[PDB]
Amino acid sequence: MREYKVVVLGSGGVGKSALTVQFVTGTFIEKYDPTIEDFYRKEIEVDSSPSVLEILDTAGTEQFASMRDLYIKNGQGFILVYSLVNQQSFQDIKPMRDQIIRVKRYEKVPVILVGNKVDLESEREVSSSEGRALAEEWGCPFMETSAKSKTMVDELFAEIVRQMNYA
Ligand SMILES: Nc1nc2c(ncn2[C@@H]2O[C@H](COP(=O)(O)OP(=O)(O)OP(=O)(O)O)[C@@H](O)[C@H]2O)c(=O)[nH]1
Ligand SMILES: [Mg+2]
């Protein structure tokens, strides 16, 4: 069976686990449980191709950045998450693409930039077009999601598998 290794990266609270847990189970996690490291496996049909996604839900907690170089080496596609209601989390995501490329040593790593928490449109600190621009300087897809939408999360993970197939 083909198998894809995806690392979900970002700062604390942005919604990494709520996005991953919505893909894997169809449920929205409301109670913030800070994450050390968690692996999930889910059989995916993208373009009608049956594969496995193995998903690495990292910690955005400052200490575990020691591990990040191992995660980047052991991983094929990367979902880079910011919360659009927190512009510091948008700022924390910009060095991370280039950190991905120092370890991988080539330019075209399959990445997607995600502005999560779009359902909280009142609280928005980061505009669509700031993210949209970052994604195009980075040459990657851009999505704004709400971990509350099964449909929005599903498209995110299906597009990471499409990205790992035209890499
Ligand atoms: N409104 C809204 N809340 C969200 C969304 N995604 C996550 N949350 C909430 O944000 C909080 C943090 O979400 P998590 O996904 O647990 O955070 P994380 O980014 O995995 O955090 P770390 O594990 O510390 O890296 C929780 O209370 C979630 O319920 C979203 O799309 N919309
Ligand atoms: Mg988490």
Swiss-Prot record:
Subcellular location(s): the record lists: Midbody; Cell projection, Lamellipodium membrane; Golgi apparatus; Recycling endosome membrane
Q: How is it modified after translation?
A: Ubiquitinated; undergoes 'Lys-63' monoubiquitination and diubiquitination by NEDD4. Multiple lysine residues are probably modified. Ubiquitination requires TNIK, prevents interaction with effectors and inactivates RAP2A. Ubiquitination by the ECS(RAB40B) complex leads to RAP2A localization to lamellipodia plasma membrane, activation, and regulation of sorting at early endosomes for recycling to the lamellipodia plasma membrane.
Glycosites? 35
Which InterPro entries does the record associate with it? P-loop_NTPase, Rap2, Small_GTP-bd, Small_GTPase, Small_GTPase_Ras-type
Keywords annotated in UniProt: Cell membrane, Cell projection, Endosome, Glycoprotein, Golgi apparatus, GTP-binding, Hydrolase, Lipoprotein, Lysosome, Membrane, Methylation, Nucleotide-binding, Palmitate, Prenylation, Ubl conjugation
User: What does the record give as EC number?
Assistant: 3.6.5.2
Please give the Gene Ontology molecular function terms for this protein. Answer: G protein activity; GDP binding; GTP binding; GTPase activity; magnesium ion binding
Keyword Cell membrane assigned: yes
Q: List the CDD domains.
A: Rap2
Judging by the UniProt lineage, the source's domain of life is Eukaryota
Q: Which GO terms describe its biological process?
A: actin cytoskeleton organization; cellular response to xenobiotic stimulus; establishment of protein localization; microvillus assembly; negative regulation of cell migration; positive regulation of protein autophosphorylation; positive regulation of protein phosphorylation; protein localization
Q: Which residues bind GTP?
A: 10-17, 57-61, 116-119
Which catalysed reactions does the entry list for this protein? GTP + H2O = GDP + phosphate + H(+)
- How does the protein associate with the membrane? Lipid-anchor
Q: Which SMART domains match?
A: RAB, RAN, RAS, RHO
Q: Where is this motif: Effector region?
A: 32-40
Which Gene Ontology terms of cellular component type are present? cytosol; midbody; plasma membrane; recycling endosome; recycling endosome membrane; Schaffer collateral - CA1 synapse; synaptic membrane
Listed under subunit, the entry gives: Interacts (GTP-bound form) with RUNDC3A. Interacts with RGS14; the interaction is GTP-dependent. Interacts with PLCE1. Interacts with ARHGAP29, SGSM1, SGSM2 and SGSM3. Interacts (GTP-bound form preferentially) with TNIK (via the CNH domain); the interaction is direct and recruits RAP2A to the E3 ubiquitin ligase NEDD4. Interacts with MINK1. Interacts (GTP-bound form preferentially) with MAP4K4. Interacts with cytoskeletal actin.
Q: Entry's NCBIfam families?
A: small_GTP
The record's function comment reads: Small GTP-binding protein which cycles between a GDP-bound inactive and a GTP-bound active form. In its active form interacts with and regulates several effectors including MAP4K4, MINK1 and TNIK. Part of a signaling complex composed of NEDD4, RAP2A and TNIK which regulates neuronal dendrite extension and arborization during development. More generally, it is part of several signaling cascades and regulates cytoskeletal rearrangements, cell migration, cell adhesion and cell spreading.
The protein's name: Ras-related protein Rap-2a
Q: Give the source species.
A: Homo sapiens
